[model samples]
Target: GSSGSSGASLLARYPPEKLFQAERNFNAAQDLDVSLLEGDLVGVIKKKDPMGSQNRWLIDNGVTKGFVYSSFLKPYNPRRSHSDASSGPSSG
Candidate 1:
């Protein structure tokens, strides 16, 4: 299944060197899996969530190999409070 146009375009933006490195990483991962699961019936049981399935495939086969499940699509906000210390108290 394709990840759609946005993902394809994002991948296409990578420099040739980066793309080569990514392909090497993917090939290495496949080799590692082959070595580890030699002669074993290792069935990859996946959950039914669509996003989770996509992330699982990425973790299993992409250049990077980790799956951090999250609902937020952007960077996490680490701030404890929203108050602006540089600004004075609101006059209104």
Candidate 2:
């Protein structure tokens, strides 16, 4: 049997699909822009700026949040390193 279905039963997950990584350093030209370093990980908070900026997007790197150009950010792919998984000792 299943519990009663409810609208408030929906649960959200963290680390959304909009995750991105900085391909290169981006110096903030304005106070509203977030300064980014190469390899910085950020999550897109908003697809469009609230002030009506067309290209720049709102981002959050945990410690800071601001707008950044779309060209400088790229999709983040986590590194996979499991080449040694086969090398293991046998036991009873």
Candidate 3:
């Protein structure tokens, strides 16, 4: 980043360089150029982005590197099968 800063420090603990799952699909801004699909796995080289926005995470999965918002990521977990997820809680 041109200046330094980034996430709420409840500090959103996940290993910076380790593999993580995409919690939701994200089409990042062109500058970042990485689009993520839900359940798609990605890995990154990271820092806390000392000079960036608190809501964004800068990362690269070997092939590509960019900043993705932290809310789009989840620690790698086996995807719950569709059948198991179909019975999602009813808001009703």
Worst 10 residues of 2 by lDDT: 5-14
Clashing pairs in 3: 3-51, 4-50, 4-51, 4-52, 5-50, 5-51, 5-52, 6-54
Off by over 4 Å in 1: 20-92
How do these models rank on lDDT, best leading?
Answer: 2, 3, 1
Candidate that beats the other on lDDT, 1 or 3, i.e. the better one: 3
Off by over 4 Å in 3: 1-17, 78-92
The window of 10 residues in a row where model 3 has the poorest summed lDDT is 2-11
RMSD of each: 18.0, 14.2, 14.8
Which sequence of candidate numbers ranks them by TM-score, best first?
Answer: 2, 3, 1
- In model 3, state the lDDT of residue 2: 10
Model 2 lDDT tens row, 19-85: 6767799998889887777656676778897788768998765456788987888765433631111
Q: What is the lDDT of residue 82 in candidate 2?
A: 12
Best-fitting candidate, scored by TM-score: 2
TM-scores for all candidates? 0.18, 0.64, 0.52
